[model samples]
Target: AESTLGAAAAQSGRYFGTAIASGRLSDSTYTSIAGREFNMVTAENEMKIDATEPQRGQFNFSSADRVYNWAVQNGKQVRGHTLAWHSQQPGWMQSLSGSALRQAMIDHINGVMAHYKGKIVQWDVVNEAFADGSSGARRDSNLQRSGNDWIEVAFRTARAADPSAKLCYNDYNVENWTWAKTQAMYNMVRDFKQRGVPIDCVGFQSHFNSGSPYNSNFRTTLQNFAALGVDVAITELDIQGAPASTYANVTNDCLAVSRCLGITVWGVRDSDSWRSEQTPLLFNNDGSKKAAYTAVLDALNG
Candidate 1:
């Protein structure tokens, strides 16, 4: 029955999911994991949805139909890709002003969330909204969205749509466990928490590099976010490229973070990871565990 990540993968006993599946993923591969891979996020972003501007409007949910049902029938839950983000938007979004733009954001969130309402648990209401609450949103970068202010608006909009599901602001670097992304993220998380908004959780896109593992920095970030009374989750985890240097570090990071709400890796193996090509993932290009693979397993089981 083992197909992709292996049945033993289920042993982690934490929430699990894949960023992607093989062109022809089997039931075993799909079933053994946490039950859901990605619906809104990966489904359309992966050449499924046409790229437009203003960051909302044009969307493709055909995969959503299959993926959501695949997980539901198989005992898995869905993580709403995201209700609002400055990226992946349709062209008309920015052009619309006043009530028009606000309506557009609402319509999009309601449309997606209501479509799968109770069928979902957590939704990335906003993805990578701010790099640093200090710098004012890293303008002009890939992660740049409208501004810090937009995040509150986005989260509010998401809540109005699917009031039942937990709303999360997903991001990388904040939990990169290394690099400035984490620092930048920490500042943002603190800002969000202080605002007393409806923010429920903070998702760490554990998209880490094996070479750079900042254990202390990572734990501190998670603990700080948790200290704010908000749930912490590692949303997208994948150890890219092999000979795994930071694997043990990143794995242990997951284990530590999971000790709280459990971790949800974006993918189980390198082949299935989005970075599988550039750096590959947990498994080598040849299906090997590098080192952090077993190291993390040991840490998790401990």
Candidate 2:
């Protein structure tokens, strides 16, 4: 068996990763475990629109640079968290309309992609465009108001800005076949493939619940997306109150799908998780490895 989670995953030509916030880097324990155990790192909030560009025509990469530089030093690949999203966007962007809004969107994407062109391996070009629930409707925002083609424009602009990085459309609740959001995402991806939309990957934010039964259809859903000529990844995985078996099941499911590129747990430790009250991570608050860590290592090694 491999001694670390990343090494075990590498044996099977896959990567094991974790989402890290810049604020947590100050904690030696956090960075020590993160750098040692994961081969890939995603900036949890540093690369988002608001964090990178809070003002119009002005960009800031200082906070994000810290995360990226650390990853580079640690020999870990970086994933750009996002370029465009409805939430956490600046008020200046939300106030625009018509051609102005579209141009603003394009400019932001270009600026960010240009700055981190070769450093990031994958870019979540558009995130959570579709809303949750059974309607399968797109989220209402300034970007959506700009035109029906905003998503396409974003991807195309990203492609021109940085042709090397894989562009991904990331969303939550798309893991299970039974979810309406899953069907909605599948339809959009299939449409993109048919029309040559320039997308390279689909990210499933597999935020699950430990109390619920494991979705046996998870692997099938990933395979179906892979058939669309795009890679699939577990972008932000966290199971609330998860046991060792829950972690193993998710790892095995990804391993079963050939084009499922890798898995990135949402955070480094339970206390640092966004859903900290639920304790949904592989390590405890004090930086000790939990049973879930061993289970994932074993799953990857197998």
Candidate 3:
């Protein structure tokens, strides 16, 4: 009954964590359970570009600082959810073009990275650069459409702003071996390594459905990404309404790969999850541990 999954994972030299929202941070019951259960925390949306820089010149860290303060107070390592991504950008950013838009991106990354330099231990410098789940093609996101060098520049800027943070490119749907998107993701990471990009890690956003097929090759795929000489982590993992056995598969996969640095559940509670309809988390609506929670701790303790 004293088992805390975060502690169990730490014993195995891996980090076990969950995502957080500002609303939950203000809730004593939610914070009490999450603070005790997770050793690391990623801002669910507080750290997104939109939230950080809602206006062109004005910057806000009001909500983000709340999440940061909570993590620090609870002795949890913080992961900056993202530095640059195509979605959720403010309207001011959308109208810029040419040198102006590019400078805006650099400014955004530099400002945000500098603000949280030492506080955040890791950062998703870039997120969802790929087109979609099936194609693995380069996304024509605002950044990508602007230029091919933007992704590389983002990572380099992050490294410059915070030399010690583990910089990563995060994306979803790449855990499925059959998905061409997986290979596309692999190739990009490999290229980054070969070309001396400043990327320090690869984040597999393992968002799985309840009925997702069990691909025996997922562990191998994760290992393959590690083979590129960068650390790999399950950054935003959520298996929708999955059974305990399903979660065990994912936890075991992370265990099997030596380079797998951590596994973070996408959210702390089912009701707080983005896909709440599917109940994609380890805790029920009332903060009680679900079977999935036990399964994860069991895997770590095993």
TM-score, one value per model: 0.75, 0.97, 0.96
- Candidates ranked by TM-score, best first? 2, 3, 1
Best by lDDT: 2
lDDT of 3: 0.87
Q: Judge candidate 2 at residue 45 and give its lDDT.
A: 93
lDDT of 2 by residue, 1-302 (tens): 78998888888888999998998888999999999999999999999988899899889999999999999999999999899899898889888887998888899999999999887999999999997888888889888888778999899999999999999999988888888889999999999999999999999998988433459798888989999999999999999786888889999989998888899999998999889998989999999988898899889988
Q: Which order, best to worst by lDDT?
A: 2, 3, 1
RMSD, one per candidate, in order: 5.0, 1.2, 1.5
Best by TM-score: 2
lDDT of 1 by residue, 1-302 (tens): 22323233345545545554424346355434324322222332432212211246545566566665655566555676766665655556645555565667667776677677776778888776654434534534222333346667778877777778888878766664445666666666677778767888888876666554335467777776777778887777665554344545554554565444555566655556667675544545454555655554555455
| CA lDDT, every model vs. true structure | 0.58, 0.91, 0.87
